[PDB]
Design a protein around this ligand. Sequence first.
Ligand SMILES: [Zn+2]
Length: 212
Amino acid sequence: LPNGVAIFKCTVPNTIALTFDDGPHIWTENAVNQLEAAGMKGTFFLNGKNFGELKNYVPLLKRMRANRHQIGSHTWDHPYLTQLSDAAVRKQMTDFENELRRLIGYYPTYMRPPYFDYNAKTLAVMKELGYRVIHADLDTNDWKFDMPASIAAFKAGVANNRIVLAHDVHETTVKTLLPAMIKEVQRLKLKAVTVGECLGEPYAYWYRVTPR
Ligand SMILES: [Zn+2]
């Protein structure tokens, strides 16, 4: 896998990656329990401070890492990265790294730009930092709070699009959309794995430990 190149699709056959942005927050524990009860893994792109704060979810963050879900970076506090200087972009990343390594010991090598906002200057910062940049190809539009519409968009797009974007900070996403997504995955007999696994990259490459 290349660094600093937007990645849109899974490549490993039979695979699906349910991914979740903007957490952790008060519903994430619920979401993780749902995935584990069904034998599935999730990929969670977290912020340092947004809805919740990393330091308030240490046990959850530890189990996410130890149980082989995938933690990715969603920057420290969710700005439009194209509206920042290259130095502040880098600090949006390393600030997140430094807080995760202090609480659970690891920091990620995968990220998703907030609002999918990035240009050639954002990507070179990501390439210098060694990050895989994960977009998506199935947008559930779950932030509109239209659950019938979201569940239907998932069902219509799941055959060809396997990097599924949701936001686990919204109660409706966790209590309504996610059960519908898990059930449809079970019907289609797909393997709900992490984004790295769905790209052919195993656990040893999702994190770094030694500080920069
Ligand atoms: Zn976001």
